[PDB]
Design a protein around this ligand. Structure first.
Ligand SMILES: CSC[C@H]1O[C@@H](n2cnc3c(N)ncnc32)[C@H](O)[C@@H]1O
Ligand SMILES: CSC[C@H]1O[C@@H](n2cnc3c(N)ncnc32)[C@H](O)[C@@H]1O
Lengths: 151, 151
């Protein structure tokens, strides 16, 4: 099972981007998303989609991201442009058996992300979006099969 | 060569999402992005990245999207949740030889998108983001090789 940890969410600014992270997480095979800043509006919007499109994905907001990431029972992945090439590490991760927590920020990433993560992982070495980084991470994790998943 | 056509851009609201579409386009192997609403700020931000990270990607804003899409010399792809499965059609598209224009909207898509497109293409049947839809479309088009591209 993969859980997404979305940090640097600003509820009075980032409704759309974080919504897109959550939709992406769900569609590409993650079981849950945890969001650092409490946002009831976001929760409502995503629960609306879960209701209408099905499946058992969950969203929590207002999380202590450092403690979640530090104490997660499984592999801690941090998506970052400065990390190791996804294609270099994805097979180890997948073949490990373990649950995975994948951290995506909004560009202003704290140092604790690098300090905690088991793997710091780049999806290309170019500046992209947390949304596209996550989509590619999950696609590679699931070897493209997440297209066969039914909700 | 692939060009991205981003429509439904609202300059006084959608700076971040559209920026992410543009970054994603560039990193995943598109040659250009055309944006419907004029946005000099966006152009400046993306030209900043092109300068600093290299390569020859281009951005134009203020485009007549219907006329661009209608008269594009090549295959017109519209990314939409209601389309044909990407995996069903991507090989035809790739093997055609032709340049490709890929249209991504912001959810409120006009009918002209369906009317013009050579292929209406779904990346999963679930609601996702234009950013993640595009990333997957380009990855599949390039068969994952866009990770070997140098800027
Ligand atoms: C607002 S974009 C910044 C965030 O997107 C993600 N990100 C951006 N570019 C990349 C990249 N090249 N590889 C992996 N993750 C990235 C990271 O999680 C970062 O915290
Ligand atoms: C604000 S999200 C709406 C836009 O994202 C893209 N999009 C969203 N969901 C999908 C999907 N499942 N497959 C393909 N494109 C999609 C389409 O281009 C749409 O115009």
């Amino acid at each position: 099972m993969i859980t997404v940890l979305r940090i640097n969410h600003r509820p009075y600014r980032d409704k759309r981007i974080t919504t897109h992270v959550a939709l992406t997480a769900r569609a590409f095979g993650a079981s849950a998303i945890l969001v650092d800043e409490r946002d009831e509006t976001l929760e409502n919007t995503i629960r609306g989609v879960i209701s209408n499109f099905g499946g058992s994905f969950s969203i929590k907001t207002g999380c202590n991201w450092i403690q979640e990431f530090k104490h997660f029972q499984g592999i801690r992945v941090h998506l970052t442009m400065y990390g190791r090439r996804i294609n270099d590490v994805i097979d180890e991760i997948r073949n490990s058996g373990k649950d995975v927590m994948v951290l995506v920020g909004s560009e202003k990433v704290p140092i604790e992300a690098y300090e905690i993560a088991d793997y710091n992982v780049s999806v290309t070495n170019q500046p992209i979006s947390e949304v596209s980084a996550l989509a590619i991470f999950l696609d590679r994790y699931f070897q493209g099969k997440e297209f066969e998943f039914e909700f």
